[model samples]
Target: VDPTHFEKRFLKRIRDLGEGHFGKVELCRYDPEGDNTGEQVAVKSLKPHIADLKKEIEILRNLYHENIVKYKGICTENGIKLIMEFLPSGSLKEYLPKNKNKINLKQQLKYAVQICKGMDYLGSRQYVHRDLAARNVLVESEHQVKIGDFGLTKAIETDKEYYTVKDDRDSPVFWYAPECLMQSKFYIASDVWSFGVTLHELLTYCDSDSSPMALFLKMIGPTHGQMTVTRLVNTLKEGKRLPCPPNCPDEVYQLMRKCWEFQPSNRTSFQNLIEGFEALLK
Candidate 1:
């Protein structure tokens, strides 16, 4: 459909909430049949200049899963709007940089497990999230974590040749795996690498730079250069890694190491990671 069609169908009477880099998110209440039965929704508007808005919305439509952010509908006219479930708790990144010490170990593990479960569900369907950082992971409430940001996500297939776009450079550099940073390939294993970095963020409960991978990159050398997962893991193991936070369980540390392992073949799958996490809770 065209832009005018979108405006006529979805944009009417929607109240603006606030502006973002790409567009804006508005609080939209929709009613049908004049019954006063209305639903509250967060409407994310994409600027007309962004040519990829349609592509992003198409990807969102194809991806329907529970741990991943839920896509309610889309408005493709009058500057592209995608509607999604409104999350009140905001991104996990917002909580960490300011209140690292305030988060208890139990809270950390709880969110971490939720993230893994989400990733596991995605991986089981053979879809790689490509971006799985704390900032991309939205907290719907105190105990629920929903992964969002499908702008960088794609479906992987062996037969098709999918070209990588060069414009996504400023997306989120800190959470990327070394292989992904260099090769621009998105795979389940690369998703695992991103998850490992996320786990580091959870353990540190501070700025992204506080993670061991960030520290190792700073102290050792460039992280974006040619590097394998195994090499990264060995470096961490030999370097004694960043110290595990106070009172953090040994199982958590072990799981982190397993996640950061260099060999993609050897790396822990999201399912296995969740099983390990469940055992820890017991």
Candidate 2:
């Protein structure tokens, strides 16, 4: 099968969309016929990136789901530009806090269900989304949301249930499961744990002062000179989990607690999460 490819000549740069560690995501107009009006798309231009950069593109090309961002094509005329669907609404992280009063509980649960469906697809494909959080989930429209940012997504063998991290890179430890924090191992269930944290972010509307890490630290109390990781590990080991957000449904909170189980084996699966949230929607 031939992959969609684009040439730099037909693409006109519009403006900067966002910036990442390796490059800048820009808005561009793709007009093959030199028409004044063209299709708008987001272009991610990677700068001499080696491992994760290629992996992101490779993973994107293979993934096609309604709940996942659509990959347009690749532009080789420039360094390396990855084209994608442009979602004007931005991320749920930014959207939640801005429209906190506008969104209702039903709308919030819908986003959770969509994310779980997308994550379920990834898990079925033997891929692990190492980073699954509010910021990474984009709002396509009021009724539509899609999971994006596959920078840390990895494809593991069916024979292996987990992937060991060899590099000490900056990670979202706040959204990680205990197996991940303690063993440095990432399983599909670890992503489920992140989903639980992401659910918390959704319910709380991504409150600035009440972030996952902040709330976690609060529960752990004053470190008194103890390390952050040490405190988190100890608190989690004690079977303590984040308290339910005000107005959060008990069933939803129960699912989040299951997702936060210390053992990966006890964590809820993405499929189960989807089912649970769907039931709540009824």
Candidate 3:
């Protein structure tokens, strides 16, 4: 709720970084000749008189970890702003190439491990990061990743993992768990399920090479309609899932399976994932 109120005269805007549904992110040259200018930073500003992001703001207020994006401060200079520690490599989605086979084993497992670590920290707090995917994950460094976009992920349905969707259009099949799709409910284990799909995203560069899988991607609403969602919904209903990409280590693949358990309670513990991943690498 507290912010670092500041004046406009002392600050400078460098360039536009990116845009989100609510606001735009721009590189900040906070002070040209001051100590802060040496380090790069950015701010995501939302319209002043509009939505209250108190839930998201409060979420970021106390969250601190190397694998989680750092919230620098809240500024009032231009609209309501969220000053954040900038990561140069963009998001995890942009870090991966379109060529699926181009990625190596070490990088895939390395990034996946870092994501699990961040989720492990979040799960320990009994917080559900309902949105857990490649795009929400940022490339903090070439080998390091930070779980960003840690915000309010809708309300729990009366302490149950299943929440009813009064809104008929609320679905993200590709990354959503089967229960999330079926019962419209999501909880901590639901997030682990998304992580399993993210594991697929980390490896498979869904392309037009195969009709079935490609259609599956299309149904999930791929960019420009390359894949479709018909098979996507059906597969989840049938309790079927995509196959692990070839060459993924057997151990890591097993971890993905553990994450995708049909029953929420049957999913692997985040602590166990961290322990298993490290042991596998050893």
- Top lDDT: which candidate number? 2
Best by TM-score: 2
Candidate numbers sorted by TM-score from highest down: 2, 3, 1
Candidate 3, after superposition: displacement of residue 221 in Å? 9.9
- Once all C-alphas are superposed, what RMSD does model 1 give against the true structure? 5.1
lDDT accuracy of residue 40 in candidate 3: 62
Give the per-residue lDDT of model 2 (tens digit) for 56-139.
889999999999999988877525678899998888988888897789999999999999999999889899898898988999
Q: lDDT by residue for model 3 over 182-244, one digit each (tens)?
A: 676677788888888777777653333422335356445466352344446566667777676
Model 3 CA lDDT for position 39: 53
Tens digit per residue, CA lDDT, model 1, 91-191: 77776666556677777777888888878776665566666777678777666777777666666676533325356554454455545555565557778
Runs in model 3 deviating more than 4 A are 1-3, 6-11, 32-38, 47-52, 77-79, 98-103, 151-171, 205-215, 218-231
Per-residue error at 37 for model 2, in Å?
2.4
Clashing pairs in 3: 162-185, 163-185, 217-227, 218-227, 218-228, 219-227, 219-228, 219-229, 220-229
